[PDB]
Amino acid sequence: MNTVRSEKDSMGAIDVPADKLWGAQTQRSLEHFRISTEKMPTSLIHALALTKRAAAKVNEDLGLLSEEKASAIRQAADEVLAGQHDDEFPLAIWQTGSGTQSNMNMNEVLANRASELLGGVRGMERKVHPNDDVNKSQSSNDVFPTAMHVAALLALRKQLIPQLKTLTQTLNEKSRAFADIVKIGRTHLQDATPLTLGQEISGWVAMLEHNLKHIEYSLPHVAELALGGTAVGTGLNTHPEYARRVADELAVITCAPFVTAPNKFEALATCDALVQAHGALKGLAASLMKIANDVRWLASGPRCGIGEISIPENEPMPGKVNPTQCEALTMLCCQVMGNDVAINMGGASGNFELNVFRPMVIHNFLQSVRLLADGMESFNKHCAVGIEPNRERINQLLNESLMLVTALNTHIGYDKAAEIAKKAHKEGLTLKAAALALGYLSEAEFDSWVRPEQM
Amino acid sequence: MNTVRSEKDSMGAIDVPADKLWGAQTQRSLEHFRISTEKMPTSLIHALALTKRAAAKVNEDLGLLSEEKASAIRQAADEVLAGQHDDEFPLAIWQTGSGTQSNMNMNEVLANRASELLGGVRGMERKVHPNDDVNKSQSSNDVFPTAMHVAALLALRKQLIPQLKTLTQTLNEKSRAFADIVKIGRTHLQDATPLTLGQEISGWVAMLEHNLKHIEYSLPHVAELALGGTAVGTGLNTHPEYARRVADELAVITCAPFVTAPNKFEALATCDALVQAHGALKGLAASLMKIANDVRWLASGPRCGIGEISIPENEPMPGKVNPTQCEALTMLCCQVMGNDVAINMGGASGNFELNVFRPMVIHNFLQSVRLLADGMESFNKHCAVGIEPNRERINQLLNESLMLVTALNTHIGYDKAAEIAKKAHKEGLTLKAAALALGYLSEAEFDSWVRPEQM
Amino acid sequence: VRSEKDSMGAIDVPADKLWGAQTQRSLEHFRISTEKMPTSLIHALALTKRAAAKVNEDLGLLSEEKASAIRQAADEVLAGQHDDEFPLAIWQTGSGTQSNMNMNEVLANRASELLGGVRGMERKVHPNDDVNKSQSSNDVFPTAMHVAALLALRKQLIPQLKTLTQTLNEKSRAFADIVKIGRTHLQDATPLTLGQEISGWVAMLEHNLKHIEYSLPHVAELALGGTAVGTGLNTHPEYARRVADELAVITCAPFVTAPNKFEALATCDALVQAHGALKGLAASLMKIANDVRWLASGPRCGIGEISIPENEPGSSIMPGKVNPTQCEALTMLCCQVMGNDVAINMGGASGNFELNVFRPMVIHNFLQSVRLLADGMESFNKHCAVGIEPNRERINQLLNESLMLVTALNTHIGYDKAAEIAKKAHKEGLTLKAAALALGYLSEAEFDSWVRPEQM
Amino acid sequence: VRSEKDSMGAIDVPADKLWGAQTQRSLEHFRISTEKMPTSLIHALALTKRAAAKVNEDLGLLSEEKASAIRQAADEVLAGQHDDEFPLAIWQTGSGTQSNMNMNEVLANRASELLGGVRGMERKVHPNDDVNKSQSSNDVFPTAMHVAALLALRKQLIPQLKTLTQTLNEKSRAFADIVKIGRTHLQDATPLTLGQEISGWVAMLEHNLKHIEYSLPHVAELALGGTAVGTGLNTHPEYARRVADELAVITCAPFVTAPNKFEALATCDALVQAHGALKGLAASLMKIANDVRWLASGPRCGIGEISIPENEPGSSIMPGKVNPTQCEALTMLCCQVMGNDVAINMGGASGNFELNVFRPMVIHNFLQSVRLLADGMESFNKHCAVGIEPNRERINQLLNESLMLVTALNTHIGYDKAAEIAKKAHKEGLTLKAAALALGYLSEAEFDSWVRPEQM
Ligand SMILES: C[Si](C)(C)C(CC(=O)O)C(=O)O
Ligand SMILES: C[Si](C)(C)C(CC(=O)O)C(=O)O
Ligand SMILES: C[Si](C)(C)C(CC(=O)O)C(=O)O
Ligand SMILES: C[Si](C)(C)C(CC(=O)O)C(=O)O
């Protein structure tokens, strides 16, 4: 729509497209911060709407906001949650480090919309006001950090963790199914002593189980909300019960154990909870990177690699099955690693009463959660559930190796056993062929003595 | 549109939305790689279209493609360049590490579109074929790396460099204008010997000039194109003049000094050119971070900070002017730092004949170029051009410091000068008040001897 | 020299050294840079060998004479008697086999002498058959890594952290009544007390302590008993549990045998996670250190709200220039911890099949970070934190110089009017009171009684 | 002990040491970790002092007797006669003032003795007035950093890089006729020769060399003459150019005076950029090292296309297990360079106003990376690269076992038919020929003449 609406702020008037619900401040920011293409994540936008919804409910309970106004604001917030106004937040991540502009973005949209809901109009003659009504008892300084934690905790609880558990179950079922399949071990990439495929996979299972605990340990710090600390953390210009009540409200509407932060100065001055929580995520990325690599190397071939297992072929050189899911997973694991560095830099750069590197920090954090969650979900259903053993190749490899020589020690002594191994190695023979050439035992004795199942 | 079209590949048939120009392979990938929200950058998409346009022209010259087919394909590519099909590339960055799916994405769109252009229809009875005609003499392995370099070089030349030069000019004009303004120096954050504001700014100018040279030194390696090496770099299934001719064509249509890579094995097996080029970018980020911090600290206040300079106030506590542009710049500088780590990890992980971490590498690289280019452009027009000195504050600070005591040495000796400084420091007096209290010189002598302009 | 030998042949080792042929060969093959195994790791390795000897002895796999001699030799290493016997670079085999052998040879040769024997080829105790009994470089090195890691965190890092927290907590309490101007975006903001500002630092350290504590259980899991690939082949079924118990007893730390030896051998996950908490601490410390040096900046042209002890000599002609050196040392080491994390992440993500072979590099960075953080907190505490004092005059001067207090006037005079004097003060360069009186909107008496900064 | 003193008073320094009061004070204030200044940096600092003495002498600012004595003392440090005289930790003042003073005191005390004088308080040469004449820690430390950096790159890194390139170039030439199966996504792909594959490694190193060379000009710019804040206050107008010339002459490197001293003092930009090229080299080296160990994997259950020298002793009962140790050492140090870059980036982005104070940490990481890369390339070259040999039988076995060659049949038989035998071979587990003959689509003779792998 070409038609504009004249909206204004302390700096004056500015034209805002008529079909949009934002106001003067969002328009100015739009024209001043034309940097790249990254905008606030949908999850962050919703967490912000949830924050305003809770504040309005509590402001009402405290008699600070009229029931009518509070009711409309709450109704407008739910529409945002319903995903009806995704197009009303055009601001880039690269704005003021406090997230003030996005706070104002939400205030203007909620104000203009709540006004219409009350039978009013959008624009300067709106019935609900961005700062006076919607931002009542708040500050960008304590609101943005709160929305960050709400977004982060819910994402971890509802997206990441469930997917992690499902992948663990799948690998655990595989572990039990292949418990009896003996394969050759590999250390330093070299052939080594045997272990079952089930045991190898149990290592992957334990890794995921350990990661889950680590992620759980990071949750209580992210559950702490800054809301109530206002501008510098003192809680100036607020009702004494506000901080506790708004945290209770959020906990109630989300069903998550949110608590108000015991120290508001630590909550406004840093992003410590997220720096620590992301530390657990980069650990999960390192574990996943290893599991994904093991899978693609074990399935390499089909003739000139390892080929001990086969994985589902999902896309359209006969046996050339590219391990694409493994490639998407390893690539996103590198991304999480780099995201951690950007986060550490921003988290270490707070000054005095406020950390102004917030948009960037939350941008990287929510991206890593999405990547890890969707990545495991994709890897699980498009690869993990269909992992199968190439029993013939496995056995071929086992019998061609020199590692089974240890089974002969108790029967013929170390010296003769090592002699057999050396001969087979220098001459390019199998352990059996060498043993028989030397005449140290009969083929029947070899077949009875070398049982890989007793490794 | 709910209506589908039945398209197929080696794996079978799949429904594709009727209003879309992509085919079977793009649809399968769409359903297999639902990971996060990041898709290929517009710049990469265009570079890919440019690559196909050049290959078609050369295939024509070699008599490998009919003039009609080649002409249509070229015409379809220009529409992509004109930005008419931005909605035809829905694939995520998190796909096969070679960029095969995006290569196929471009092949299908170009095929279906060129078909219509020839008076045909889209779908299975298309006149132009994705692999046979559009991917003729190519492979995903050499095409994606080529599109990466075309995108990277043009972005550096047309976006980054021009903005860098403009910012340098602005700071250079400021340097000359404030050449005569003496201010207090600061080392370790402590007061130190004087220097002019013009000199301080010249340091910023030299930093930018040095960065430009470094960035220029990285350009020749990125100008090398892998096109012609095919699957493993041997150039199997290609015309001997193809590699040279396609590089010439691209150089001609872009006006950039593109050359075919002297070693195709180094070109397909690594992302070395970009790892090195991004090293120069993280250097520019470190320099910019410093310039941005200097600016915000020098302008801090308006009463309880430094306040030596004032910057344009761009948004709506009277003197409280938040240095928002400085905050957007410092935040993106941290992002470039983290991007470098993800890139280094992917670049170090190539295996044998191919590096399969490409989508992620190019995703991070183009983001850093956009961030740095738009960041300097924004910082320049919304802050740098309007930097002004608070001459009164500067002079106040100068006269209140103890650092000017050095001017008295040649007149009264080191011992008396240090005595004056110690007294002023312990008692909280100005150098003049202390000197007069001691009676070592007259006020007229002080005023004549301590001339900060001769630092 | 002396002539020692292995399967590859004989080689000359200096007569005055207790190491064998394998260590000598490595000394010639891995001449990379100057980094060697840190003392903490050397001790953790000796402790692993000491515990293995006791259990082997208990199971009847090793004779008392040999077991006791190996333990005695191990104790000498712990006593700092053999520091020059470990010349190997960190940049060796990724499994740490070289260092496992370095310990095996030194312990065997010395245990020989301890039994009235001689060092070298004619030794009574054997490095591989005796000292390395029931073990493998594969499960021994990871065990030594966890022992050194857990002990460094519990004995060095945690106590120093607690001490620094107690100091800043005292300061928070002592300056609880001093009101100062807040700063957001580096701009003048509403007031808070120096005590509240310092309590923020305190809360940061308290949170970090709990994060570090949550990482200890995974680090306490030991790989010993996993043997070559984690199956435990060639070990008594009670070996793994017994050796873990032995290690717990002699170190007084809650060590346990890893429930899954495959996870233990194939990864460095516990350390990747434990280090995540360390870089978390580095980000917090960087912030605290920066606040301190900025607050102490000056003496005349900065902020100068606090004063810190001057430790290094200065120039007679330049009194007042007190460079915040402890803050500079601390911020530099914090940048180092961040870089260390990246190196550890890359090595930790690179394991293949049954064994991660980036171990020497991972333990090198991990132990350095712990060393940096513990010594850094102690130094900053003793030479800076304990001496933080407020410059009460500047603090009040700035407070009464800012336009931020105009807020208190709003409740006594309309927003526009209160803001009116603020505009004049700002524009004319006057103070809130000067402008208020000059504008005749109030009197000195009522202004002073209205603008109460100590009431927030 | 001996009693030395400064402006803060006197303090006891061990009699057998040449350092003064300032160094002793720092020794007590900065007891952080175990890292000290590296020898290369110590030498670069002595060289800076030696050059400063000559110019001061030439300008008539210093007496011949003192100047010559200071230069003689400086040369003794270069000769390795005073390594134990620099005990200071890297984690000190961010400007490197402590280390500048450590050099000033050691040089003054020694120069005193050299003039028939005594070390300590009664010295004939003065650390601050004589040795530090016309200088400041601010412009001296950055100068020493560039001198050490440029020299390490030109003398150590570049020659080793060239050597490794020459070796791999020889191998590329020697194996130019050996055809092998290509691998993309870790899957069997079309053929290429071992020589072509190795030429890729060669091209990588050649490109890296030029990138490293492009970074040298900025590193050659010196800060000396910039003095405290870069203005050059208290220096003769010819000082900066003369001292740069002097340094160029005695080191034989193209050192020049920095055109803008403010950029020189306020940043570490040259090193941030030069190190970008180093991490670039680390990514390349990591890839080459991985290809080598994967290609040599086995001996029976891996790829096993090549063989590499066995350097460490193995087990008699386990012949064939050759762990790629040089590759492991190399990959670990490459991860280290990546982490180092992060630490350097953070310090380099943190300068404030007239001076960057993260210098000791930046030079610490930079010199380590150079050390790691140079020694790593030498070790990998001598103990691995020179000994790479192809296992011709396995290479052919794999080549004739893959279905990839079916491509050559297409030109002699329709796509579908050629693919038909491939399907059978794959499904039935037969070889291309076995399936082709069993399907009766051709004869042994025509198959062999059609499938020519050596014709790509
Ligand atoms: C209309 Si007025 C200016 C009072 C206003 C007030 C407010 O935002 O609190 C608005 O709606 O923007
Ligand atoms: C129609 Si067919 C299957 C031959 C085809 C061919 C091709 O893609 O080269 C296509 O258009 O997809
Ligand atoms: C002397 Si022998 C070779 C038996 C030997 C044995 C061993 O290490 O187990 C040694 O001391 O190295
Ligand atoms: C002995 Si005095 C104090 C003059 C002195 C002088 C100096 O350093 O310039 C020293 O050697 O330290």
CSV table of C-alpha atoms in Angstrom, one decimal, chain A residues 16-261:
chain,number,residue,atom,x,y,z
A,16,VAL,CA,4.3,5.0,8.2
A,17,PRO,CA,2.6,2.7,5.7
A,18,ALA,CA,-1.2,2.8,6.3
A,19,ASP,CA,-1.6,-1.0,6.3
A,20,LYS,CA,1.0,-1.5,9.1
A,21,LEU,CA,0.4,-1.6,12.9
A,22,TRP,CA,3.8,-0.2,14.0
A,23,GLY,CA,4.5,3.4,14.9
A,24,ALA,CA,7.0,6.3,14.6
A,25,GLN,CA,9.8,4.6,16.5
A,26,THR,CA,9.8,1.4,14.5
A,27,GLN,CA,9.8,3.4,11.2
A,28,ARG,CA,12.8,5.5,12.2
A,29,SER,CA,14.8,2.4,13.2
A,30,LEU,CA,13.8,0.8,9.9
A,31,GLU,CA,15.4,3.7,8.0
A,32,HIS,CA,18.5,4.0,10.3
A,33,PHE,CA,19.5,0.3,10.6
A,34,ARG,CA,19.4,-1.1,7.1
A,35,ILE,CA,22.0,-3.7,7.8
A,36,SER,CA,22.0,-7.1,6.2
A,37,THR,CA,18.9,-9.4,6.2
A,38,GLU,CA,18.6,-10.9,9.7
A,39,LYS,CA,15.5,-10.0,11.7
A,40,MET,CA,14.3,-11.0,15.2
A,41,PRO,CA,13.3,-14.8,15.3
A,42,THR,CA,9.6,-15.7,15.5
A,43,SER,CA,10.3,-17.4,18.8
A,44,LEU,CA,11.7,-14.2,20.3
A,45,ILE,CA,8.8,-12.2,19.0
A,46,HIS,CA,6.3,-14.6,20.7
A,47,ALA,CA,8.3,-14.6,24.0
A,48,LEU,CA,8.1,-10.7,23.9
A,49,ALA,CA,4.3,-10.9,23.4
A,50,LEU,CA,4.1,-13.3,26.3
A,51,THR,CA,6.1,-10.9,28.4
A,52,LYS,CA,3.7,-8.0,27.6
A,53,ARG,CA,0.7,-10.2,28.2
A,54,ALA,CA,1.9,-11.1,31.7
A,55,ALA,CA,2.9,-7.5,32.6
A,56,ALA,CA,-0.6,-6.3,31.6
A,57,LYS,CA,-2.3,-9.0,33.7
A,58,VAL,CA,-0.2,-8.1,36.7
A,59,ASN,CA,-0.5,-4.3,36.2
A,60,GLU,CA,-4.3,-5.0,36.2
A,61,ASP,CA,-4.1,-7.0,39.4
A,62,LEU,CA,-2.2,-4.1,41.0
A,63,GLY,CA,-4.8,-1.6,39.8
A,64,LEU,CA,-2.3,0.2,37.6
A,65,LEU,CA,-4.1,-0.5,34.3
A,66,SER,CA,-7.8,-0.4,33.7
A,67,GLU,CA,-9.4,-3.8,33.1
A,68,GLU,CA,-10.6,-2.7,29.6
A,69,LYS,CA,-7.2,-1.6,28.5
A,70,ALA,CA,-5.4,-4.6,30.0
A,71,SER,CA,-8.0,-7.0,28.4
A,72,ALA,CA,-7.5,-5.5,25.0
A,73,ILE,CA,-3.6,-5.6,25.3
A,74,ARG,CA,-3.8,-9.3,26.3
A,75,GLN,CA,-6.1,-10.0,23.4
A,76,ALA,CA,-3.7,-8.4,20.9
A,77,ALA,CA,-0.8,-10.4,22.4
A,78,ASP,CA,-2.6,-13.7,21.8
A,79,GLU,CA,-3.0,-12.7,18.1
A,80,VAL,CA,0.7,-12.3,17.9
A,81,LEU,CA,1.1,-15.7,19.6
A,82,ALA,CA,-1.4,-17.1,17.1
A,83,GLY,CA,0.9,-15.9,14.4
A,84,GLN,CA,-1.4,-13.3,13.0
A,85,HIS,CA,1.1,-10.4,12.9
A,86,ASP,CA,4.4,-11.9,11.9
A,87,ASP,CA,4.7,-9.2,9.2
A,88,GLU,CA,4.6,-6.4,11.8
A,89,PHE,CA,8.2,-6.8,13.0
A,90,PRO,CA,10.6,-5.6,10.3
A,91,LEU,CA,13.5,-4.6,12.5
A,92,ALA,CA,17.0,-6.1,12.0
A,93,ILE,CA,19.1,-7.8,14.6
A,94,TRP,CA,21.7,-5.1,14.1
A,95,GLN,CA,20.0,-2.3,16.1
A,96,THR,CA,20.6,-0.8,19.6
A,97,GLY,CA,22.3,-3.4,21.8
A,98,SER,CA,19.6,-3.3,24.4
A,99,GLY,CA,16.7,-4.3,22.1
A,100,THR,CA,14.9,-1.1,22.8
A,101,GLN,CA,13.7,-0.7,19.2
A,102,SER,CA,12.2,-4.2,19.2
A,103,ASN,CA,10.6,-3.4,22.6
A,104,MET,CA,9.1,-0.3,21.0
A,105,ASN,CA,8.1,-2.3,18.0
A,106,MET,CA,6.0,-4.6,20.2
A,107,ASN,CA,4.6,-1.6,22.2
A,108,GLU,CA,3.4,0.2,19.0
A,109,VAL,CA,1.9,-2.9,17.4
A,110,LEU,CA,0.1,-3.9,20.6
A,111,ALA,CA,-1.0,-0.3,21.2
A,112,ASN,CA,-2.4,0.3,17.7
A,113,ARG,CA,-4.1,-3.2,17.7
A,114,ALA,CA,-5.6,-3.0,21.2
A,115,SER,CA,-7.0,0.4,20.2
A,116,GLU,CA,-8.9,-1.1,17.3
A,117,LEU,CA,-10.0,-3.9,19.6
A,118,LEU,CA,-11.6,-1.3,21.9
A,119,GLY,CA,-13.5,0.2,19.0
A,120,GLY,CA,-10.8,2.8,18.3
A,121,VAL,CA,-8.4,3.5,15.4
A,122,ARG,CA,-4.7,3.1,14.8
A,123,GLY,CA,-2.4,6.1,14.7
A,124,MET,CA,-2.0,9.2,16.9
A,125,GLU,CA,-5.6,9.1,18.1
A,126,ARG,CA,-5.3,5.6,19.4
A,127,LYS,CA,-7.0,4.7,22.7
A,128,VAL,CA,-4.2,2.6,24.0
A,129,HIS,CA,-0.7,4.1,24.3
A,130,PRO,CA,2.7,2.4,23.5
A,131,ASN,CA,4.6,3.7,26.4
A,132,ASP,CA,2.0,4.7,29.0
A,133,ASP,CA,-0.2,1.6,28.8
A,134,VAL,CA,1.7,-1.2,27.1
A,135,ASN,CA,5.2,-0.5,28.5
A,136,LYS,CA,3.7,0.3,32.0
A,137,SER,CA,6.0,-0.6,34.9
A,138,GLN,CA,8.7,-1.7,32.4
A,139,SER,CA,11.9,-0.7,30.7
A,140,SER,CA,13.6,-2.0,27.5
A,141,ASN,CA,16.5,-2.9,29.9
A,142,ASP,CA,14.5,-5.5,31.8
A,143,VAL,CA,12.0,-6.5,29.2
A,144,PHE,CA,14.4,-7.7,26.4
A,145,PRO,CA,16.5,-9.8,28.8
A,146,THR,CA,13.2,-11.4,30.1
A,147,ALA,CA,12.0,-12.2,26.6
A,148,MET,CA,15.4,-13.8,25.9
A,149,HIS,CA,15.1,-16.2,28.7
A,150,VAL,CA,11.5,-17.1,28.0
A,151,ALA,CA,12.4,-17.9,24.4
A,152,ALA,CA,15.5,-19.8,25.4
A,153,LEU,CA,13.9,-21.9,28.1
A,154,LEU,CA,10.8,-22.9,26.1
A,155,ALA,CA,12.9,-23.8,23.0
A,156,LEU,CA,15.2,-26.0,25.1
A,157,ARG,CA,12.3,-27.7,26.9
A,158,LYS,CA,9.9,-28.1,24.0
A,159,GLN,CA,12.2,-28.5,21.0
A,160,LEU,CA,15.7,-29.6,21.8
A,161,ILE,CA,15.2,-32.0,24.7
A,162,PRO,CA,12.3,-34.1,23.2
A,163,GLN,CA,14.3,-34.6,20.0
A,164,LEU,CA,17.4,-35.6,22.0
A,165,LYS,CA,15.4,-38.2,23.9
A,166,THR,CA,13.9,-39.7,20.7
A,167,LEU,CA,17.4,-40.1,19.0
A,168,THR,CA,18.7,-41.8,22.2
A,169,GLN,CA,15.8,-44.3,22.1
A,170,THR,CA,16.4,-45.2,18.5
A,171,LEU,CA,20.2,-45.7,19.0
A,172,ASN,CA,19.4,-47.7,22.1
A,173,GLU,CA,17.1,-50.1,20.2
A,174,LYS,CA,19.8,-50.5,17.6
A,175,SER,CA,22.4,-51.2,20.3
A,176,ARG,CA,20.3,-54.1,21.7
A,177,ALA,CA,19.5,-55.5,18.2
A,178,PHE,CA,23.2,-55.7,17.2
A,179,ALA,CA,24.5,-56.8,20.6
A,180,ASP,CA,25.7,-60.1,19.1
A,181,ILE,CA,27.5,-58.8,16.0
A,182,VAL,CA,31.3,-59.0,16.4
A,183,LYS,CA,33.2,-56.5,14.4
A,184,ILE,CA,36.9,-55.2,14.2
A,185,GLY,CA,37.8,-52.3,16.5
A,186,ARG,CA,39.8,-49.3,15.3
A,187,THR,CA,42.1,-47.0,17.2
A,188,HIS,CA,44.2,-44.3,15.5
A,189,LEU,CA,42.2,-45.5,12.4
A,190,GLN,CA,44.2,-48.8,12.5
A,191,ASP,CA,42.7,-52.3,13.0
A,192,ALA,CA,42.4,-53.2,16.7
A,193,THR,CA,40.8,-55.7,19.0
A,194,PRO,CA,37.1,-56.7,18.4
A,195,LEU,CA,33.9,-55.4,20.0
A,196,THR,CA,30.3,-55.9,19.1
A,197,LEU,CA,28.4,-53.3,16.9
A,198,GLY,CA,26.0,-53.1,19.8
A,199,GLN,CA,28.8,-52.0,22.1
A,200,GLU,CA,30.0,-49.4,19.7
A,201,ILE,CA,26.5,-48.0,19.4
A,202,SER,CA,26.1,-48.0,23.3
A,203,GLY,CA,28.9,-45.5,23.3
A,204,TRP,CA,26.8,-43.2,21.2
A,205,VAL,CA,23.9,-43.8,23.5
A,206,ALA,CA,25.9,-42.9,26.7
A,207,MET,CA,27.1,-39.7,25.0
A,208,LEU,CA,23.6,-38.5,24.4
A,209,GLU,CA,22.4,-39.5,27.9
A,210,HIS,CA,25.3,-37.5,29.4
A,211,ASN,CA,24.5,-34.5,27.2
A,212,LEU,CA,20.9,-34.5,28.4
A,213,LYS,CA,22.1,-34.2,32.0
A,214,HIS,CA,24.4,-31.3,31.2
A,215,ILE,CA,21.6,-29.4,29.4
A,216,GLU,CA,19.3,-30.0,32.3
A,217,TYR,CA,21.9,-28.5,34.7
A,218,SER,CA,21.9,-25.3,32.7
A,219,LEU,CA,18.1,-24.8,32.9
A,220,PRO,CA,17.7,-23.3,36.3
A,221,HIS,CA,19.9,-20.2,35.6
A,222,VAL,CA,18.0,-19.5,32.4
A,223,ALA,CA,14.7,-19.8,34.3
A,224,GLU,CA,15.6,-16.5,36.2
A,225,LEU,CA,13.8,-13.5,34.9
A,226,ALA,CA,15.1,-9.9,35.0
A,227,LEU,CA,11.6,-8.4,34.9
A,228,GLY,CA,11.2,-6.0,37.8
A,229,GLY,CA,14.7,-4.5,37.7
A,230,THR,CA,13.7,-1.6,35.3
A,231,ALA,CA,16.4,0.8,34.0
A,232,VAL,CA,19.4,0.0,36.2
A,233,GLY,CA,18.2,-3.0,38.3
A,234,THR,CA,17.0,-1.0,41.3
A,235,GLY,CA,13.3,-1.5,40.5
A,236,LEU,CA,12.7,2.2,40.6
A,237,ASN,CA,9.2,3.1,39.5
A,238,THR,CA,7.7,-0.2,40.2
A,239,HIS,CA,5.3,-1.9,42.7
A,240,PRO,CA,7.3,-4.0,45.3
A,241,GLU,CA,5.3,-7.2,44.4
A,242,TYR,CA,5.6,-6.8,40.7
A,243,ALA,CA,8.8,-8.8,40.0
A,244,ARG,CA,7.5,-11.9,41.9
A,245,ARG,CA,4.0,-11.7,40.5
A,246,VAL,CA,5.0,-11.3,36.8
A,247,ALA,CA,7.3,-14.3,37.1
A,248,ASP,CA,4.5,-16.3,38.6
A,249,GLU,CA,2.1,-15.3,35.8
A,250,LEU,CA,4.6,-16.3,33.1
A,251,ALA,CA,5.3,-19.6,34.9
A,252,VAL,CA,1.6,-20.2,35.0
A,253,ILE,CA,0.8,-19.4,31.3
A,254,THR,CA,3.9,-21.4,30.0
A,255,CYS,CA,3.9,-24.2,32.6
A,256,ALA,CA,7.7,-23.6,33.0
A,257,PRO,CA,9.4,-23.1,36.3
A,258,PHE,CA,10.2,-19.4,35.8
A,259,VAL,CA,11.4,-17.4,38.9
A,260,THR,CA,12.4,-13.8,39.3
A,261,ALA,CA,16.1,-13.3,39.3
